[PDB]
Amino acid sequence: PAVHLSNGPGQEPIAVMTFDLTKITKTSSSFEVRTWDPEGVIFYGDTNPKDDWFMLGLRDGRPEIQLHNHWAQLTVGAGPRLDDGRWHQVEVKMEGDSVLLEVDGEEVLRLRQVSGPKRHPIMRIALGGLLFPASNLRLPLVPALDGCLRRDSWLDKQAKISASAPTSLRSC
Template sequence: MGWNWKTMTVGLLLVLGMLGKGAHGGGNGRGKKEISGAGVFYLGQDRDTWRPLVQITVNLSEITDVKSRFQLRTFDPEGTIFYGDTKSGEDWFVLSLNKGFPMMQICKEGMLLSVTGGPKLNDGKWHTLEVSNQGKFVVLVVDGTQPLVVGLKPKEKDEPLSGVLRLALGGILINTENLLVQYKPQMDGCIREGIWLNLTLPWETEEEEMWQCHENIKPGSYFPGKGLAVFNSSGGHIHTVITLEFWGDFKEMDGTICSIKKPGEEPLFYLTADRSAKVSVTLTFGAETIRMQPASSRLRITFHSDAVKVHLDREESSAMIPVSDPGYADMWAVGSLSIGGLLGEDDTGTQFLTGCLEKIQIQGKNLDMNLAFNEMSIYSHSCPA
C-alpha cells in the first residue's frame, strides 16, 4: 500500500493530538515508561542525538480526526519537533526548525521533498502551529497567518487506510542519511496544549525522569549543576590574542564556569564561581590565582603569548597572570574547552556549574552549545527567567 496524503496528514495530526497538560508515567511490561498524552514536553532532554524523546505506534484504522494544533516555544534555531512514518520507515515525514524557520521533509515512494518557510519561531514566545490536510496538500499555519504548503500527487491511486503508523517526538526513527536536508537534531524547546484527534493511547519513553519546561525563559544556557559542554579548543598556538568572554550574573553562579586541559593532564586553566563568598569569581592558571567580585555582567579573558589578562566590562585590564608554563603555548591547539564543569585527567567532569550564562563568545563569535561533542545535561539556549 502507498502512503496517500490523508495517511500522511493523519500521522502529523496524531502526534500533535497526544500533547497536553501533564505527563504521568507508568509501565508497559516492555521496560519502557508510559507517558500520558496530556503533557508539556521538553524536547532537549539528554539522550542519543537522534533518538526520540517519546514515541507511539497506532493502527491507522483507529484515527478519525485529521485536524491538529499545538504550541511551541524555543530560542533554539534548529532541531526536531516530530516525526511520523508508515511501512516501517519507507514513507516518512519530519517537522523541524532550520535557522529558526519551520521545515518539513517528506519521503514518499522513494521521492524526497523538503520545504522551509513561514515566520521565524525561535524568539522565546509561544507560537500556535496548526497542521491540516487540503486535498493533495499539507498546510502548516503559524499563529493564524503565513501558511507553509507542501503538495505531492503520487502516481498510484489512494487506497483505504490500513496498517500502523509510528510517531515520535523530538527525534526520528530512520537513518539520518535518508534526510534531504541535514540539521542538528536536539532542540531546547517545549511543546504544550495539543488539541487533536480522538485517541488517548499513552506514549512510550526510555527516560526515567522527564525534564521540566521552565514557566518563563530568557536567552542563554542554563546549567542545573548536573553536567557540562566540552569542545575541541582547536584555536591554534597562542601567537595571537585569543579572547574568551562570558555574560551573566556571576553573583548567582556556583561551580566551574569553564576549564581548559590537554589530553591526559589536569586542567591548566579554570574559572570558578562561589555565590556564598564575598569574592565570587576565581581564575586559576597553574599555581596562580586571581579573585574578583564582578560588579557587572560581563567578564573578558584574553590569552596572550606571555600572559593571561582579565577585563571587567571596560577595555582596561583589571588583573594579569604572567605565563611561563611550557604547556601553555599549545593549550588551545590540542586541548579541550569545557563550559559548566571541571574536566579531570580522565576526561570526566566535576564541580558542575549551577546558573545561567547569558552569552559565551570565543574570538567575538557566539559559542553554540549544540556543537559540544558530549551529552551536556544543560539547557542549551534558554535560562529560567
C-alpha cells in the same frame, strides 16, 4: 503543562506514539512550541522509515518539512522564524491530497499533491527526534531541539495503539 523536547545529549525522541491508520478520522496535530534554538526536529511521522516518512523541524529558526513517500519527496522551508522565545501555535493538517502548515493561526505552507487515498496501516509519531539516523534525512540537520512543548494533540486519540512511558518526560 510543558515538557522539554530535548533530554540530554542523545538525539532520541522524547516520546513515541503509534496509531491504527484504519481508525484515524482526524488527520491533524496541533501544539505550542517555545525555543531559542534555530535547528532541530519538532516531530517525525511515518508508516515506514524507508518509504513513507515526514519530519517537521526548524532550520535557521524557520519551519522546515521533509517528506518522502510514493507521491512526493521534498525539502521545504516556510513561515517566520520561531526561535524568538515566544510561544507559537502550530497545526499540521492533511486536507485532501495536501499537507497544510499553520503557524500562529496563519497558513504559511500548503504542500499540494503529496498524499494519496497498499500502505502499512501503523503510523508512528515521534516527538523531538527522528526514528532513523539524521544521516538518512533528505537534507541532514542536528535533531536536538532545545525547546518546550505544550497543549499538544496528536491525530485521533481513538486510534492510538501505544504511547511511550510519560515518566520519561521532563517538565519545563
